[PDB]
Every structure is written in structure tokens, then in C-alpha cells.
Amino acid sequence: ATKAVCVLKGDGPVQGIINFEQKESNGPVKVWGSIKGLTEGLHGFHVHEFGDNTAGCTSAGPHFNPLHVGDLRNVTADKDGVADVSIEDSVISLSGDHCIIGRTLVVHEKADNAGSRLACGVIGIAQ
Amino acid sequence: TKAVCVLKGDGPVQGIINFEQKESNGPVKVWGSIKGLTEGLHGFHVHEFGDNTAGCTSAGPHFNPLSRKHGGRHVGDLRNVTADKDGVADVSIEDSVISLSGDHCIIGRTLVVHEKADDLNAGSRLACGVIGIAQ
Ligand SMILES: [Zn+2]
Ligand SMILES: [Zn+2]
Ligand SMILES: [Zn+2]
Structure with a gap:
């Protein structure tokens, strides 16, 4: 793949769509999109080990860190609860x-x- | 290698499907159950894109990297699952x-x-x- 996409959902009002693009194998990944329904301020933003949603987020497993790789740091929500994301990792x-x-x-x-x-x-694979 | 998938949609249909493959060149065991279905046969397919931005509408066509006709074939052609009188389909496939x-x-x-x-x-x-990748 050169493109991936993720639909964020939970038990509460937090919802978003996050895109990933890596035009070059082993090159930087662009991460962008928007998340809404958040409290104003900073929120941890992580890849977790398992794509297992059988128990909602509780089944995602630990931070992805094959023996921190998954630590994309933080997104910031505005006064409307909206976090615009535009990252290069x-x-x-x-x-x-x-x-x-x-x-x-x-x-x-x-x-x-x-x-x-x-x-x-x-x-998921988007392209 | 293990994988899992939670099926959701706009009505009562839902299920959890597990995948396991012991060797890279070996068959994949596919198992789990789907509820909320009409009694009888239901197409069961892998589609190309893991894009659920428009629910199932955005998943693209049947997964077909070798550009074959449909059978059960496209890689993603897992034929049919059968729902009982209560709308429950047991899945137990080796593909x-x-x-x-x-x-x-x-x-x-x-x-x-x-x-x-x-x-x-x-x-x-x-x-x-x-x-998704599973434990
Ligand atoms: Zn985390
Ligand atoms: Zn299909
Ligand atoms: Zn097909």
C-alpha cells in the first residue's frame, strides 16, 4: 500500500477520519485528517499493537513497539472540540x-x- | 499469524470472524459467527480496501490482485455462509x-x-x- 485510512469511533462522541500516505517505500508517512468530539487541549495519539476491535478500544493491546514506534505524540483540540491533524512521521x-x-x-x-x-x-489499506 | 474482523452494519447484522495461518504458504483457517441474517445463503467476501469511511460502500470491489473472474476466482471470494432459522451463520472455512x-x-x-x-x-x-492483526 501507499495509502491507509482509519475511521475513529468510540463509546462517546469522539469521531474522526485519519489518512496515511507513504509514496516511497520506507519513506516518511504523512498523517492527516480531523477528529471531533474532544475536550479543548492535548490528546495522546498512538498506534496500538492489535487491530482487534472485538471489545472496542479495550482490545487494541499495548502501544505498538516491536522489540514507542506507535507514539505519534499528541493532537490538539480547539474550543469546538476539533483536532486538525497534519503530521509527518x-x-x-x-x-x-x-x-x-x-x-x-x-x-x-x-x-x-x-x-x-x-x-x-x-x-486499513486505502490505495 | 492471526487476524480478526468485527462486522458491523446499518441493521441487526453483526459478527466476529477470526483468521489463523500457521505457515506462510499454508491455508488460512477462518472461523466465527454472524448474527442478524435472513435464513439461508449469504455471499462472504474480502473486498480490496480497508476503507470504512462510507461504511461498506467504500470497501471497493472483491479483492482481486491477479485480475481473475469471479468464482469460489478472485482472491477474496470466500463463497457463502449459511444462516440458520434464528439468523445465525456459523463460519468455519479453510481457504x-x-x-x-x-x-x-x-x-x-x-x-x-x-x-x-x-x-x-x-x-x-x-x-x-x-x-486487523490479532493476538
Ligand atoms: Zn495509547
Ligand atoms: Zn462482495
Ligand atoms: Zn469475487
């Missing part, structure tokens, strides 16, 4: 050892200690 | 065309259950989910 990848396709993207209650998982979805 | 690695890899794609029988014309897409 050179650690995640859409192939190889750091492949995140089929894993889970999670937005957290607090800045990353990041607290509850508000919304998540499985990262 | 040697799908894989969890290589070019027939279905991780990150979409599993879809259909309104009607796949004639091996499956009709509308009732429920779907993105296939």
Missing part, C-alpha cells in the same frame, strides 16, 4: 517491521498517563 | 487462496457479508469490518 511505515496496516489507531483522554481510549479504529 | 502474508494478504482489507447468495449477484453489503 519517519518511524511508522505502511510496510516492513514498523508496518501499521491492520493495527489500531487510538486517541486518548489526556496528553501522553494518556488515560482512557476515547476512540479507535483499525488502520 | 488456501487468501493469505495473511505475501500478495494474497488480506490484513487491512474489508470483510463483507452480503444480502444474497453468491452464485459462485450477492446484492447489497449488509455488514463489514477491516481485517
Whole structure:
């Protein structure tokens, strides 16, 4: 794949669509989109190990870190609860050892200690 | 290698489907159950894209990397599941065309259950989910 997409949903109002693009194998991944339904301020934004939604976000497993790879840091919601995301990450990848396709993207209650998982979805092939 | 998929859709249809493949060149065991179905046959397919932005509508066509006609074939052609009188379909498939690695890899794609029988014309897409890596 050169493109992936993730629909974030949870038990509460947090919802979003996040795109990923890696035009070059092993190159930087562009991450962008928007998440709404969040409290104003910082929220942890992570790839978790398993694309297992059988128990909602609770089944996502730990931070993806094949023996921190999944730590995309934080998104910031505005006064309307909307987080616009536009990131370049050179650690995640859409192939190889750091492949995140089929894993889970999670937005957290607090800045990353990041607290509850508000919304998540499985990262799917988009192109 | 193990994978899982939670099927959701606009009505009562829902299910959990598991995947396991012991060797890269071996068959994939597919098992789980789907509820909320009409009694009888339902098309059961992997579709190309793990894009659920428009629910099942955005999943693209049957997964077909080798550009074959439909059977049960496209890589993603898993034929039909059968729902009982209570609308419950048990899934227990071994398939040697799908894989969890290589070019027939279905991780990150979409599993879809259909309104009607796949004639091996499956009709509308009732429920779907993105296939994810599992523990
Ligand atoms: Zn996390
Ligand atoms: Zn189909
Ligand atoms: Zn087909």
C-alpha cells in the first residue's frame, strides 16, 4: 500500500477520519485528517499493537513497539472540540517491521498517563 | 499469524470472524459467527480496501490482485455462509487462496457479508469490518 485510512469511533462522541500516505517505500508517512468530539487541549495519539476491535478500544493491546514506534505524540483540540491533524512521521511505515496496516489507531483522554481510549479504529489499506 | 474482523452494519447484522495461518504458504483457517441474517445463503467476501469511511460502500470491489473472474476466482471470494432459522451463520472455512502474508494478504482489507447468495449477484453489503492483526 501507499495509502491507509482509519475511521475513529468510540463509546462517546469522539469521531474522526485519519489518512496515511507513504509514496516511497520506507519513506516518511504523512498523517492527516480531523477528529471531533474532544475536550479543548492535548490528546495522546498512538498506534496500538492489535487491530482487534472485538471489545472496542479495550482490545487494541499495548502501544505498538516491536522489540514507542506507535507514539505519534499528541493532537490538539480547539474550543469546538476539533483536532486538525497534519503530521509527518519517519518511524511508522505502511510496510516492513514498523508496518501499521491492520493495527489500531487510538486517541486518548489526556496528553501522553494518556488515560482512557476515547476512540479507535483499525488502520486499513486505502490505495 | 492471526487476524480478526468485527462486522458491523446499518441493521441487526453483526459478527466476529477470526483468521489463523500457521505457515506462510499454508491455508488460512477462518472461523466465527454472524448474527442478524435472513435464513439461508449469504455471499462472504474480502473486498480490496480497508476503507470504512462510507461504511461498506467504500470497501471497493472483491479483492482481486491477479485480475481473475469471479468464482469460489478472485482472491477474496470466500463463497457463502449459511444462516440458520434464528439468523445465525456459523463460519468455519479453510481457504488456501487468501493469505495473511505475501500478495494474497488480506490484513487491512474489508470483510463483507452480503444480502444474497453468491452464485459462485450477492446484492447489497449488509455488514463489514477491516481485517486487523490479532493476538
Ligand atoms: Zn495509547
Ligand atoms: Zn462482495
Ligand atoms: Zn469475487
